[PDB]
Design a protein around this ligand. Structure first.
Ligand SMILES: OC[C@H]1O[C@H](O[C@H]2[C@H](O)[C@@H](O)[C@@H](O[C@H]3[C@H](O)[C@@H](O)[C@@H](O[C@H]4[C@H](O)[C@@H](O)[C@@H](O)O[C@@H]4CO)O[C@@H]3CO)O[C@@H]2CO)[C@H](O)[C@@H](O)[C@@H]1O
Ligand SMILES: [Ca+2]
Ligand SMILES: [Ca+2]
Length: 418
């Protein structure tokens, strides 16, 4: 496991990670207080499957609850009240055991952290920040969903639970928790939630202070149309928006550019995500995914959130693409362990590793065939990927001797190695 910073000092940890998203939306409902036991028991399996890191749920206890019609939720971690680890996923003791098992098996543990807001109204919590001291966004005049003097980012819905992450004392509080997670809970890095809610630069500061050499990823989900009309971003590509955040936070960013193309474009257009960018400084910072707990379905209740879910007919194609291309891929718990795509994903992980494909590997797209046809220059081997294509043989598009590595869904998914 190579472990440096990119040529632009972005914390991609060598550019060779393969991450497993360690949970789905309904875990606290389906395996109440048992999740960490489940991960401890699966640790060896996860490690054997080929994952170098696991994205853990928010460790901070969440006893929130909400409901609007048919839809209900809470306790998943995004509306935590204090840093106590005895939450709905399991106890502090179980977390430590879980993190120890994962780490023991060579899997780095990445924690999901929510610095933007907290469950302000929770009657029994260990963290109580009073009003009138500048700890909250609403300690200042709050016009709309725009930075105010108490919060240099967007607000979460109403903004009444938004923290002034820039307040010396709030910053310091998060800083200390990140260091704790690293020193007693075996953190190898963090997944930053709702990155639109506070300054990119603050993420860099936090990383510098607590885990400079760790892996980090930011969740920036905000389209061009969400920026003000006078902002350059209102007319920029999804790629430029996430790339800009990454340059400032010095952390890799979720490829929402690729996700938007998977949802709205044709398969041939998948070449427009950040990870397909001809400049390695651009594609190496992309953190690719097919679905997550927000965008995809989850076993259980209401099918989870499914805010921007990939149709089942493209799941295999979607995984074939992210596992064989540049950037850093993320595999969704469910596709891997619930829905039966596990064997298929296992195969591709092996292909990725044997070819020596990494964050900055070169990718070329071929224009003369239907579907998506790409040539990937791994450090060990060259890959020819043809998805929903009429391509006849790898030799039509690449020089060399190729063997078939993957052939699934009636040739809709084909991968060849040199
Ligand atoms: O006190 C502040 C606000 O509190 C109340 O908000 C409720 C929401 O109405 C609920 O829908 C819910 O919010 C969830 C949200 O549904 C869920 O997607 C998740 O959101 C994450 C998401 O994973 C991710 O995309 C990311 O970008 O950030 C989001 C925020 O972390 O988690 C949310 C929190 O559980 O629950 C909240 C709070 O209970 C109230 O209705 C508001 O008016 C009020 O302003
Ligand atoms: Ca690494
Ligand atoms: Ca905010």
């Amino acid at each position: 496991d190579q472990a440096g910073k990119s040529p632009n000092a972005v914390r991609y940890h060598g550019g060779d990670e393969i991450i497993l998203q360690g949970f789905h939306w309904n875990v606290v409902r389906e395996a109440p207080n048992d999740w960490y036991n489940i991960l401890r028991q699966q640790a060896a399996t996860i490690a054997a499957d080929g994952f170098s890191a696991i994205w853990m749920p928010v460790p901070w206890r969440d006893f929130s609850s909400w409901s609007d019609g048919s839809k209900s939720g809470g306790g998943e971690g995004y509306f935590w009240h204090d840093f106590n680890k005895n939450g709905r996923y399991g106890s502090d003791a179980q977390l430590r055991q879980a993190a120890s098992a994962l780490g023991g098996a060579g899997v780095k543990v990445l924690y999901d952290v929510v610095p933007n807001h907290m469950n302000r109204g929770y009657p029994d919590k260990e963290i109580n920040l009073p009003a009138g001291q500048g700890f909250w966004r609403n300690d200042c005049a709050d016009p709309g969903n725009y930075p105010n003097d108490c919060d240099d980012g967007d607000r979460f819905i109403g903004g009444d639970a938004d923290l002034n992450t820039g307040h010396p004392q709030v910053y310091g509080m998060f800083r200390d928790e990140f260091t704790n997670l690293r020193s007693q809970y075996g953190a190898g890095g963090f997944r930053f939630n709702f990155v639109r809610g506070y300054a990119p630069e603050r993420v860099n500061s936090w990383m510098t202070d607590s885990a400079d050499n760790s892996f980090c990823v930011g969740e920036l989900w905000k389209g061009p149309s969400e920026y003000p009309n006078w902002d350059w971003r209102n007319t920029a590509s999804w790629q430029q928006i996430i790339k800009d955040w990454s340059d400032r936070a010095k952390c890799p960013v979720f490829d929402f550019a690729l996700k938007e193309r998977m949802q709205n474009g044709s398969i041939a257009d998948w070449k427009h995500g950040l990870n397909g960018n001809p400049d390695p400084r651009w594609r190496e910072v992309a953190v690719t995914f097919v679905d997550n707990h927000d965008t995809g379905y989850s076993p259980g209740q209401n099918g989870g959130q499914h805010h921007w879910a990939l149709q089942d007919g493209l799941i295999r194609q979607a995984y074939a693409y992210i596992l064989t291309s540049p950037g850093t891929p993320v595999v969704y718990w469910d596709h891997m362990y619930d829905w039966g795509y596990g064997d298929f994903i296992r195969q591709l992980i092996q292909v990725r590793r044997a070819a020596g494909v990494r964050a900055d590997s070169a990718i070329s797209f071929h224009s003369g065939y239907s579907g998506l046809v790409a040539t990937v220059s791994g450090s060990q081997q060259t890959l020819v990927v043809a998805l929903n294509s009429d391509l006849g043989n790898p030799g039509q598009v690449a020089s060399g001797s190729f063997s078939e590595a993957v052939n699934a869904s009636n040739g809709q998914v084909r991968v060849w190695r040199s």
